[PDB]
């Protein structure tokens, strides 16, 4: 389902990497949201101008 034969013999490292990638989930989503809304506010300012 993920990978096709993917180090099933010893997979703990992969769980750790996926935990890191979930941290990346949080970081990336928060960063994207904040940046896009700040530039939306910039859009609003430009609109009023």
């Amino acid at each position: 389902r993920q990978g096709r034969q993917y180090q099933a013999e010893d997979l703990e490292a992969l769980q750790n990497e996926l935990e890191a990638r979930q941290e990346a989930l949080s970081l990336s989503v928060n960063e994207g949201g904040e940046r896009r809304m700040e530039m939306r506010q910039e859009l609003e300012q430009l609109k009023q101008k």
């Binding site: 769980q15 949201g33 530039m39």
Partner: protein, 50 residues
């Protein structure tokens, strides 16, 4: 300012594409990690390849 607005819309599209792609991909990663840590959170060690 209209050119700025056009570029800003382009940037909105870029941010939305990035956010979508990352959120989906890492959500499926979340599902895979949950399956691993549920069905085989070192249940392979219980198996131990004995």
């Amino acid at each position: 300012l209209r050119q700025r607005h056009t570029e800003l819309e382009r940037e909105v599209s870029r941010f939305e594409d990035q956010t979508q792609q990352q959120r989906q991909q890492y959500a499926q990663a979340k599902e895979s990690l949950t399956t691993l840590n549920r069905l085989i959170p070192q249940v392979t060690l219980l198996l131990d390849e004995t």
